RNA sequence: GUGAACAGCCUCUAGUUGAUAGAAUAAUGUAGAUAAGGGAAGUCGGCAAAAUAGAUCCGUAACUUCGGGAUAAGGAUUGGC
RNA sequence: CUCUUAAGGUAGCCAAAUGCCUCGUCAUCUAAUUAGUGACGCGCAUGAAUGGAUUAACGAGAUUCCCACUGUCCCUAUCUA
RNA sequence: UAUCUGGUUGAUCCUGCCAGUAGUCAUAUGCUUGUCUCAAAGAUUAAGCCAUGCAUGUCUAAGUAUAAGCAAUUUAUACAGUGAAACUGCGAAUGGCUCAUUAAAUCAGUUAUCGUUUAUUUGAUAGUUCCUUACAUGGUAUAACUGUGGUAAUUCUAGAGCUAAUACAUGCUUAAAAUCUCGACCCUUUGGAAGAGAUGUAUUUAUUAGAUAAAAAAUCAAUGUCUUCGGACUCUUUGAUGAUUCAUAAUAACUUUUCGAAUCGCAUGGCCUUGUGCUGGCGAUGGUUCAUUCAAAUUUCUGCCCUAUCAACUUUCGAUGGUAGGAUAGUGGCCUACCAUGGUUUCAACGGGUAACGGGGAAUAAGGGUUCGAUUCCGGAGAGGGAGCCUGAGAAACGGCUACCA
RNA sequence: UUACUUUGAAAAAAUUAGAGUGUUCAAAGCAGGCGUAUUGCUCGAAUAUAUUAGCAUGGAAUAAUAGAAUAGGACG
RNA sequence: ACCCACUCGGCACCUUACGAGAAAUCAAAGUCUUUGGGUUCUGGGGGGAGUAUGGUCGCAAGGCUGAAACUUAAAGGAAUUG
RNA sequence: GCCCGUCGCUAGUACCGAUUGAAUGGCUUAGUGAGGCCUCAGGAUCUGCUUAGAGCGGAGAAUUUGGACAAACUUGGUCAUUUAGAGGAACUAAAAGUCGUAACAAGGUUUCCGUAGGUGAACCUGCGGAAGGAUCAUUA
């Protein structure tokens, strides 16, 4: 249709930003990002709808302007930037920081990590190919390319990344019984180990899995990230640590803490 | 479907960049390059071994299979290096909680390893379009019926 | 201009399809550049998305293989001789891909004459130590010989010279040098 | 010889060169030609004249006693080397 | 029902090469049509081998229109024997 | 949210339709009309025609200011605040509208790119440029502007004279190796050796590697070390894929030789032989390849309404396939050349109709269904009808141009 | 060896169904709720769906399909 | 050849309704709201009408195929009493 | 009683129909062919390299060779959808006209079928059916 479409609509958004139906015909329309618009943050998102900090469009950009937050470790200008998974967001003037992991439900949770927790990043090697002159290189979920890593490195392992700098500290191996969070899919925003990987010689490989509460479920390679050794991730979890209680089972937590 | 001794067109016929040299000399003079098509597809006795040439061939040619791999028996091969297969479906046609049978004709290249008649269940699988028409090659083939 | 579409064409059951819409530019193609032998004229083609096609209008003098010696001399491409799609291009002697010219062999005679040191086809002591070392490979073939005894040798055009802008091929040698014989012999 | 051809046109053999003759070149005739633009307005009536034309390929309607109509109609081609 | 003289125009066809009135009337063709065609028919005076109706193909038969064509015309001029 | 009643007879039971009843995010119309919330609305007839207005423009500290521009009174004598114009930059391909085309087409769900293009965005990537004379930074050219002008008339412009750049055209610049060739002279053996080139990246072709699964001795050319006249042989370099001629590297060349920072803003620090020497801070804009992102292009499988008073269809002149080429961003009869005679069909082709854009959905509420979808979302098409094209990363664009028809 | 059958994955949001919640009721909306109301706490935005095709999976009844007849069969 | 008993396969017939049907009736016209063994054909109020049109077959008469506009509340079946 | 057909009037729908009938759109053979694009050229003007003056390079307007794309005009055909028409010939409505009384009673010649011919009209006759008949019946 002529080129690159600048426009998004309401009721085109994603569903995981939870926008109203009302109060507008459009999205922010994520800018060209680290991650793709479909599974990402835009900044105004977070600052407006959920730290409930700014109240317009026009106060989103005042922040900005005024400098304040940064990203990954690095100060971001753009509106809609689409921050995504396992991302930073520091905000010097008021002190805190956020990770952004998925809820249980499958959101982006409101989640705040500390002054330290913020220096490093996990991420899942997309990648790892020879570049110029015999250099190798590998690339993360967020589009991080790392160069000269360790040649342990394949796809679907995750990389703890230090932000200030770059590079690689350690990393994690993927093989059975790791712990991993769910990207996208039915089963998205939870947290579990690896029963088994069915192989698919052509694509579509499914992974097993089984969390806290030893419940079992699958879903594809692709969605499968590697957040650490079973029992301890390498990053903070929120509330529930992404465990799938059933809705029967939510109503009484509703109404066991409703009370006097 | 006997093919003569393959040189015969009027440009040359050779793999792309398989060079056998002159002043080297081997007990089979030239060279042969074949490959393995993946998806455990046995890559057979007479692509290394044959004369032919068929730079649509999935293997010893220039073609790679990926995406769907499909069966169906053969309804044409009157045409050359490539043939008419038949898929066979069924359709649900819920109103009536039944069936009606329709069916679909692919057209395929075949490799000069492979021999195939009218008859000859075969599988195939889907490279890039070669052809026009055909989207599909031939990569195994059974035997056809009693 | 010129389309590449498919759904001009007919059905593979032989209907003939309305016209669905209009012609895009992505879909399109462009006029053949035929190019003869001739001083280099070379004209830029702004391809999609920017970058450059290069037509080759006149070709004269490009570069050449010599496969087993594995050394590459440039020279002039006097004219065509053989093409196998269409004799139009040798008669108006056009330069395309598979072409089957005829090239200068000057220049790869005196490489190998200041290599191999046996003048082709009939002091500096540190030379004849090198000469010494590269003989017992030095003889090459008898059709392969023949033609440095004319000047000029039996190359064909391995780039697209309306695409490329550079027009290059590899002399003829092995069997292939003997099936463009027999169809030059057998023909003309 | 050209050509489908005992056509028309030119020719070998053979036969003729016979049809009162000289000078001019008005009108009107007889016979032969060509006409700008219009195109049957001419006329009893297109009378006369003009247009068509060989061959190859293509396409060929109603009607019909199914044999025709049909060269229907409509088009393209044509030398030399 | 009558009537002179045996019957009293059936099937068909028509201003027809048969219609006086008559350039019949209606439609069609045309700028305009005593023309043509299609209709209508108490048809002066169509009509059944005195053959009636139809009819493909054929025609130096009679008739109307269309396209092409043209000195037929506007409107005449020039050339040759 | 599993219902029926009225009407054919003298009366009767059936068949059977007509009639009643109820619903409609379904349209019109009539009569009537007070209050809150909510809010469809020239789709249908005619994608018929349209006076006028509006709808696309855009500057940060950070490209270009000598405005006969405003402004204080500038340490501001190169500039510096503000800042029209104009230059360069980017956008104008998004939106919004409409449903006219379109029946395997679009479209849906589902694959493909080991078949391509990609502004931007994010992440990395560059010591190599001259060769035998700016690097304290080459050269002109122009807009705005001023001034002389033409036309009834337009977002028309002529010619005269100035002046800028991240415009246009140019163009130097830096480590240590190491491997290649070629080779003055020394002259015997198992013999050698200065110093003259070549090596960034990209373009083009050719060739080479990109390998292994289980172990042992014989062969030839010349070496590849090495020790003490005895000759020993110690060692094979892969990253990835279901899969590659993949990534990446190697040699020989090729090229109207691509990029390799003559670029701006804030600061004003540190050294010492003090020359305005040498060195330095965070930024902005760029730039080569790669990945990423926003996309694009094609693509696998299966699925459309009425129609046989449409049964054969395609193949001149591409119909189906093979080869070669050409063209494209790229696959492919996309086009050309040559060659074969293929391809679809009663499991309904081909053809015709559609008062047909497809879908998400909507109405109806036993079940099974019937009917509808111009229309808020997605995809598609179009801007009176057709075609052609310039700019561009992206257009076959129409609030762009060119032509024809109307 | 298919057809079939189960489980799953991958399925847009709206819409339908449906949980929750005192928009004063409601149609809706996806808000809200407790507070010390002097620089506060905090649970949400569930859930299930056209069942054709594709993909992965368990099932082997039903119905199909192949297999040694001039043995050119199996096996070491 | 005749008689008798048995048994297939026929053209019918009788009684009973086991059932079925609106009934007349039906050993199928049963095994049907306890609705499915397989399969072919046709019908969807009465007219208009087997008309018009196209096609096709025939020497022709004709056959085969076969609409719509419009019109109408009945038409019809079986049985009952008159 | 019911009841058929012609005939006679009133209104309505469609049909056939001379007009080589009109109209709109799609696909089209032929002829012609704008425009930009590619290409062979051209060279108003302006202009750089090596050496008044000569040799070889770059920039470039009008104009132009050839080519593909190709609107569109003319003339034909084909398919679709709509439509005018003198006249023709049906059918349908409205009722207690005219003619006779075909069918329903053995309807007064049982009715009906296919076919064939004939007749103002319903109908009549021939052949072969059927029973839906006015006969389920002559081992007598
Ligand atoms: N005939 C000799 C050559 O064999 C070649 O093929 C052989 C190997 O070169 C080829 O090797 C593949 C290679 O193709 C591919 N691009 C990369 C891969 N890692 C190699 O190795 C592959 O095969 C080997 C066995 O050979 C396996 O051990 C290995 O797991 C597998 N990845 O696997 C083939 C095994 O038979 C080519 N056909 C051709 O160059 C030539 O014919
Ligand atoms: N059939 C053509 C053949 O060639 C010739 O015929 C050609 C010519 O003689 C003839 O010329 C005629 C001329 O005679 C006649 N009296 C007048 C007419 N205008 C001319 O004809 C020409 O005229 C002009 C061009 O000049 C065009 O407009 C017209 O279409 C054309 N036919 O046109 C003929 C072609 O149509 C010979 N008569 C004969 O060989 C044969 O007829
Ligand atoms: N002009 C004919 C039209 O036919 C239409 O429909 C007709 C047919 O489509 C329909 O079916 C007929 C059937 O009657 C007839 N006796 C048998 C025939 N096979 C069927 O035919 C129909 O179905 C078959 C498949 O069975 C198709 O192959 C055929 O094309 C189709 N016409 O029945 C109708 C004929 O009775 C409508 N009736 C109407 O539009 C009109 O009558
Ligand atoms: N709205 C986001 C999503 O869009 C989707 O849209 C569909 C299409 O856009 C997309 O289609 C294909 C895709 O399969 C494939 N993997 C990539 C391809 N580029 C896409 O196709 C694209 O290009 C084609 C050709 O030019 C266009 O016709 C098409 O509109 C465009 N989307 O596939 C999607 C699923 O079939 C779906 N509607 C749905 O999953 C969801 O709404
Ligand atoms: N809108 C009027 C015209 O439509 C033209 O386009 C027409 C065509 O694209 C298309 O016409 C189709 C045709 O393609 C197809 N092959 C046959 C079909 N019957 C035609 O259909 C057309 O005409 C029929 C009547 O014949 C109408 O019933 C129908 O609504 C109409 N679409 O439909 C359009 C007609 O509406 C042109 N765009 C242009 O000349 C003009 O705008
Ligand atoms: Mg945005
Ligand atoms: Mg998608
Ligand atoms: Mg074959
Ligand atoms: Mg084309
Ligand atoms: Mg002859
Ligand atoms: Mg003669
Ligand atoms: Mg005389
Ligand atoms: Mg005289
Ligand atoms: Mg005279
Ligand atoms: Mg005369
Ligand atoms: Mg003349
Ligand atoms: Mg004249
Ligand atoms: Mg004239
Ligand atoms: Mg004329
Ligand atoms: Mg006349
Ligand atoms: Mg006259
Ligand atoms: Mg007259
Ligand atoms: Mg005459
Ligand atoms: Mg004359
Ligand atoms: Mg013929
Ligand atoms: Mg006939
Ligand atoms: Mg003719
Ligand atoms: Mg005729
Ligand atoms: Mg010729
Ligand atoms: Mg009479
Ligand atoms: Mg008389
Ligand atoms: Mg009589
Ligand atoms: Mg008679
Ligand atoms: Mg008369
Ligand atoms: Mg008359
Ligand atoms: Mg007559
Ligand atoms: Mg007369
Ligand atoms: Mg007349
Ligand atoms: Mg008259
Ligand atoms: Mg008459
Ligand atoms: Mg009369
Ligand atoms: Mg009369
Ligand atoms: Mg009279
Ligand atoms: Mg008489
Ligand atoms: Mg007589
Ligand atoms: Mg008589
Ligand atoms: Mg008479
Ligand atoms: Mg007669
Ligand atoms: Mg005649
Ligand atoms: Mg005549
Ligand atoms: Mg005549
Ligand atoms: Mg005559
Ligand atoms: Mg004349
Ligand atoms: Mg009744
Ligand atoms: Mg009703
Ligand atoms: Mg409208
Ligand atoms: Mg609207
Ligand atoms: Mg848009
Ligand atoms: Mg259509
Ligand atoms: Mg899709
Ligand atoms: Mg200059
Ligand atoms: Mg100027
Ligand atoms: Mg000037
Ligand atoms: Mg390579
Ligand atoms: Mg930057
Ligand atoms: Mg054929
Ligand atoms: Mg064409
Ligand atoms: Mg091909
Ligand atoms: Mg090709
Ligand atoms: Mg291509
Ligand atoms: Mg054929
Ligand atoms: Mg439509
Ligand atoms: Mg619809
Ligand atoms: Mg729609
Ligand atoms: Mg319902
Ligand atoms: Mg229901
Ligand atoms: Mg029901
Ligand atoms: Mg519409
Ligand atoms: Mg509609
Ligand atoms: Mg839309
Ligand atoms: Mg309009
Ligand atoms: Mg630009
Ligand atoms: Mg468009
Ligand atoms: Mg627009
Ligand atoms: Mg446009
Ligand atoms: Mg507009
Ligand atoms: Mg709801
Ligand atoms: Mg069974
Ligand atoms: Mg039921
Ligand atoms: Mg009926
Ligand atoms: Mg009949
Ligand atoms: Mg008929
Ligand atoms: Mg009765
Ligand atoms: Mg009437
Ligand atoms: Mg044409
Ligand atoms: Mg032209
Ligand atoms: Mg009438
Ligand atoms: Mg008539
Ligand atoms: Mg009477
Ligand atoms: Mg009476
Ligand atoms: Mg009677
Ligand atoms: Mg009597
Ligand atoms: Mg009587
Ligand atoms: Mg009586
Ligand atoms: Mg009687
Ligand atoms: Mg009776
Ligand atoms: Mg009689
Ligand atoms: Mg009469
Ligand atoms: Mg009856």
Redesign the pocket.
Known sequence: ???????L?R??A??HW?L????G?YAPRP????????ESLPLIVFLRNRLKYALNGREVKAILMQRHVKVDG?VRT?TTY?AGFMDVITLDATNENFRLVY?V?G?FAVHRITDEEASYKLGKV????????????V?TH??????YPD?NI??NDTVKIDLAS?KITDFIKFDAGKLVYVT?????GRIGTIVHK?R?????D?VHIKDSLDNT????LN?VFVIGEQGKPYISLP?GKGIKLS?AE??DR?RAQQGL | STELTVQS???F?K?????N?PKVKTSKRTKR?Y??????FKTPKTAIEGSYI???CPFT????????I??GTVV?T?????I?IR??????I??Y?RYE???????V?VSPAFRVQVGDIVTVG??????????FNVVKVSAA?? | ?????????????????????????????????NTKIGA????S???????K???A??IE???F?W?SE?????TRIAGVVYH???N?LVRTNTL???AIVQIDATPFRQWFEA?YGQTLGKK????E??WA?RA?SAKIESSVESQFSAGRLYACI?????????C???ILEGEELAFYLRRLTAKK
């Open positions: 249709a002529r080129g690159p479409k600048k426009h609509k009721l085109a994603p569903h939870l109203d139906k009302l109060s015909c800018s060209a990002g680290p991650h793709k618009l479909r690095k753009d689409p809820d439900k959101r997309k990648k790892v190919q020879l570049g110029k002159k015999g250099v190798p290189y690339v967020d589009g991080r390319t790392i160069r040649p394949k796809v770059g996208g899919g039915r089963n998205l069915e698919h010689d052509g694509g579509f499914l479920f699958v879903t594809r969605n509330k809705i939510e109503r509703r | 067109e009027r440009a016929q793999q792309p960049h398989i060079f040299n390059w490959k393995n098509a993946g998806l455990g068929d730079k649509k040619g220039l073609v790679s299979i990926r995406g769907k499909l069966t044409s009157k045409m050359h290096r490539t008419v898929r066979a479906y069924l359709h649900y819920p109103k909680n049978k329709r069916h679909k004709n692919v057209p290249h889907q490279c890039r379009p070669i052809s026009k028409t055909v989207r019926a009693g | 201009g010129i389309s590449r579409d498919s759904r001009h064409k007919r059905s593979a059951t032989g209907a003939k399809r309305a016209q669905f819409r209009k012609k895009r530019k992505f879909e399109l193609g462009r006029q053949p550049a280099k004229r070379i004209h083609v702004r391809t999609r998305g920017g970058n096609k290069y037509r209008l006149r003098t490009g570069n293989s496969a594995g050394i590459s001399k440039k196998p799609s269409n139009e395309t891909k598979a290599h500096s002591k540190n030379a130590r090198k070392a017992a391995s780039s697209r010279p309306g695409q490329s802008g550079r290059d091929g590899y």
